[PDB]
């Protein structure tokens, strides 16, 4: 349990492209997937929204054990009958109503926010929360298209220098931060495909 | 101008001569662990 606070654990996270070849045949490509060293959070504040409700504000309110930074190496090697989706799965000892807010940022400025409300299902002594096949926003689809149409892979990483995603999972009723994940991206250059590393965000 | 302008963001790398975006410190020059830049 890497991406886990005391109240919530993200077991799975993935963004994907699914293509329907025919009514019985589906092909799925994963851009990124999850299935701990410390980073000084001050080093990344400029890359995320600030002011009230922003990254610094959220971190100061805590708990400090809810705060993570994930570095992805995205797999963009892939080709009417397409679906861009995001799937994620969470577990908690507690029966809560959770809200998941995902903010896409450019130069630390919010471009778009997607918000989802999730209810618990009882599962083997704990409660499970699943965001299943959530539609990726048009902005993200277009961003991927524009990336893939860049002549050089260094240009892709250059663009991705100033592109971040912030995911905040909250208890809707109490507003407690259950998980806060800052995402940073590079393009995968490996034979392995998509890769990741997970860090704890610390005050200093 | 707009900082969230998607075209400008991509134009800045495709056509550096006409780049009109905020100037920033590259991640590789920041105080970050080695694991941040080396994939597993
Ligand atoms: C729009 O509604 C914002 C939702 C963004 C969800 C995060 C999915 C991560 C996308 C990874 C694709 C790789 C892009 C370089």
Q: Which domains does chain B have, with CATH numbers?
A: 1-37 (6.20.430.10)
Question: Which burial class, exposed, middle or buried, applies to A85 when counting CB atoms under 10 A from its CB (0-12, 13-18, 19+)?
Answer: middle
Cα distance between residue B35 and residue A197, in whole Å = 7
Cα(A81)–Cα(A106) distance, rounded to whole angstroms? 29
Residues A91, A126 contacting (CB under 8 angstroms):
yes
Do the chains contact at A159 and B13, CB–CB below 8 Å? yes
Q: Which fold has domain A1-204?
A: Coagulation Factor XIII; Chain A, domain 1 (2.70.50)
Q: What DSSP element (H or E) covers A136?
A: none
Cα B9 to Cα A26, A162, A171, B18: the distances in Å are: 34, 9, 35, 11
Breaks after residues in chain A, judged by C–N over 2.5 Å: 35, 79
User: In angstroms, rounded to a whole number, what is the distance separating the alpha carbons of residues B6 and A24?
Assistant: 37
Q: What CA–CA distance (Å, rounded) separates A172 from A56? A: 20
Could you count the other beta carbons within 10 Å of the beta carbon of residue A17? Answer: 19
Using an 8 Å CB-CB cutoff, list residues of chain B that contact chain A.
Answer: 3-4, 6, 9-10, 13-14, 21-22, 24-27, 30-33, 35-36, 39-40
Distance CA A100, CA A178 (A): 10
Q: Which residue of B has its CA nearest to A72?
A: B39
| Residues on chain B touching A192 (C-beta within 8 angstroms) | 39
User: To test ligand 1's pocket by mutation, which of A136, A138, A159 has the most ligand atoms within 8 angstroms of CB?
Assistant: A136
Taking the CA of residue B30 and the nearest CA in chain A, the distance in Å comes to 7
What sign for the dihedral angle of Cα A140, A92, A29, B35? positive
Could you give the residue ranges of the DSSP H alpha helices within chain B?
Answer: 6-14
Resolution for the entry shown, Å:
2.2
Say if residues A141 and A167 touch (Cβ distance below 8 Å).
no
Going from N- to C-terminal start, the domains of chain A cover: 1-204
- A143 to chain B, minimum CA–CA distance in Å? 8
């Amino acid at each position: 349990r890497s991406v886990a606070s005391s109240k919530l654990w993200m077991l799975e996270f993935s963004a994907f492209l699914e293509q329907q070849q025919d009514p019985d045949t589906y092909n799925k490509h994963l851009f990124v997937h999850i299935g701990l060293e410390a980073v000084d959070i001050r080093q990344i504040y400029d890359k995320f929204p600030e002011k009230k409700g922003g990254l610094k504000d959220l971190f100061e309110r805590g708990p400090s054990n809810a705060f993570f930074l994930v570095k992805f190496w995205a797999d963009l090697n892939t080709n009417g009958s397409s679906f861009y989706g995001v799937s994620s799965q969470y577990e908690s000892p507690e029966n809560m109503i959770i809200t998941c807010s995902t903010k896409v940022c450019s130069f630390g400025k919010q471009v778009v926010e997607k918000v989802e409300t999730e209810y618990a299902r009882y599962e083997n002594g704990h409660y499970s929360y699943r965001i299943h096949r959530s539609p990726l926003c048009e902005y993200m689809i277009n961003f991927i298209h524009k990336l893939k149409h860049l002549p050089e892979k260094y240009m892709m990483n250059s663009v991705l220098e100033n592109f971040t995603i912030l995911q905040v999972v909250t208890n809707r009723d109490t507003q407690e931060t259950l998980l806060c994940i800052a995402y940073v991206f590079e393009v995968s250059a490996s034979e392995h495909g998509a890769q990741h590393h997970i860090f704890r965000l610390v005050k200093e | 101008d707009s900082e969230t302008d998607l075209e400008a963001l991509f134009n800045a790398v495709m056509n550096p001569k006409t780049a009109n975006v905020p100037q920033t410190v590259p991640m590789r020059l920041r105080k970050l662990p080695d694991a941040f830049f080396k994939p597993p």
